[PDB]
Amino acid sequence: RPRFSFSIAAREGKARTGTIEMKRGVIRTPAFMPVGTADIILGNTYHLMLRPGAERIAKLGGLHSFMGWDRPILTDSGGYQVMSLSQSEEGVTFLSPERSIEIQHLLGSDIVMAFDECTPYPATPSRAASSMERSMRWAKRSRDAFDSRKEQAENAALFGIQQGSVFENLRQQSADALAEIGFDGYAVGGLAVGEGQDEMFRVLDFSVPMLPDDKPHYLMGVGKPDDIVGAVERGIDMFDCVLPTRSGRNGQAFTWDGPINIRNARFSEDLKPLDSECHCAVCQKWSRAYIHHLIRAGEILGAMLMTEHNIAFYQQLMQKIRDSISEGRFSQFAQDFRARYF
Template identity: 70%
Template sequence: MQPRFEFDIHATDGAARTGVIRMKRGDIRTPAFMPVGTAATVKAMRPAEVRASGADIILGNTYHLMLRPTAERIASLGGLHKFMGWDRPILTDSGGYQVMSLSELRKMSEQGVQFASHLDGSRHMLSPERSMEIQRLLGTDIVMAFDECTPHPATHEEAASSMERSMRWAKRSRDGFDSGAEHAEVAALFGIQQGSMYEDLRRVSAEKLIEIGFDGYAVGGLAVGEGQAAMFGVLDYAPAMLPADRPRYLMGVGKPDDIVGAVVRGIDMFDCVLPTRSGRNGQAFTHAGPLNLRNAKYKDDSGPLDPDCACPVCGQWSRAYLHHLIKAGEILGAMLMTEHNIWFYQQLMAGLRSAIAEGRLTSHAAAFLGRYKGGE
């Protein structure tokens, strides 16, 4: 039988690791990129297409699903996996980031966050206990602790207060998760390190999370406007504060060059809306950097999006055709561009895994970044 949760590290190269997370619904190869399926769908893609790209796990969102169609409705229909037709692991964001960023009418207290729905203005309370309940109703495989997303920039005092609250909420999340015994027997719970840009606060946060005990640990509070250099500055020390035998997850990241730099610094898991959102807006990620297919220079270009991409889109359709679809506003354009981007990200992760396993990550990363940033 598959275990509830195990993380096996197969090889290391500097701070980088490659391995496998084993769960009841299947293995997750790391470093892993999780396509974002916020509202029970990876936009413009069928589950089988997402799986064919190489994705082992996808991400859903507590905030969006609690509002529509509601966690209770999804539970009554057999759970999130059955509801959306995805039979492999799902990680759900706790909703903390969304209640801070999407709801203008919110009131935070020690209990949780009272907020107005961005859909219809209805009032709701999201607390650590309610977040755990929602994720249990969804049948989530990897549950994220409920935390406060520290705004950026923040003073040391502001960041410390926010971090301490997140740590109190982490303990309540742990207790709430454990109270759902049947779900806790098959799912995993990740804690989230906070502390903004401050090394001393990150260390305190890590110590408190380790004391509580989690299956994996996320580095939270990054990719919030601080810029790549500042993010890498935090990643130079933050992952090493977390247990080496547990997965490390960088939430909401990111661009391909962000991911490469974070893997080099010891991160194992990623998610980001960029490949799907960019695809819907006519941008393709390629080994030679991003391409804007709305640009008129592609209207007569008979070549593939990326000559080095193994995806079905690059194997069949030209840049000229994709340019036409996007300019004409055809749904197929968004579908094909998204499929390519998801494949590109999965090929990126596969390349990083191979490079770590073979001890050549430094040269692999340098070659990838040199070409990616150099453009066509």
């Protein structure tokens, strides 16, 4: 396989399905990328840089070996999480374009994200523009850092991240800057930051067509099953979200009939599996009643079973999306999905 090759096998409206070929594997698109701790998983740059440290991970052989995962790994650039959990033209103290790229190289990830500024919401036009301008300067710095490390330039891929808040002209300027620099793929940043789905979809409507059509489009931090379906309708190819994982440990299971909270007493005698159609290993062997029982008793096994189911549900959703676009039936699927989920 090549370092990076994206091929679109089929289209329906703005929705696409295809494959990214990389040296460690093929990624079928549209793709859901779960956290590692699926064709590609997400590493946690912010956590790892603090514990055990990027250098320590490199000493242990890089994240593939550490985690026992030999397929592609995507890493975020770290500043989203810095801003959220912990500033100058050089970067952030609490990380810079150059240090972020270096950390991601030490971790050994296959898809590397440019170091950006996820503009808070709401933002005024002026503020959105200053922030986006800084991110575009950081995007060029990220490009140059990545290109300067041969092992990285030759074996990994670099994605640029569009900013501009909710403003069409700033999103256009950002898309133009990123395409002039040139990246392997393009993320839509600055969303899923409290603006709500209608506004997110409005911004995606004009923002995704500004990105190069022939490269993958990644919507960062999205999301709920319905967010994902609507984003695919708008031209998005890749997704990451902690919802499946966090939901799992909180008693929430995803089903084709919507999310359920398994701790509710209504499940104490329910002998159905978490979802009726789900092909996952949990749904093959255990009832809602037993998983309810485990979670209420504080058993670790319960939360593990829930998480496994939720990650499998999300991959079943992406498979159904891929097959439906390939078959010219995605419009119908989305409408069928929505009808039942809500």
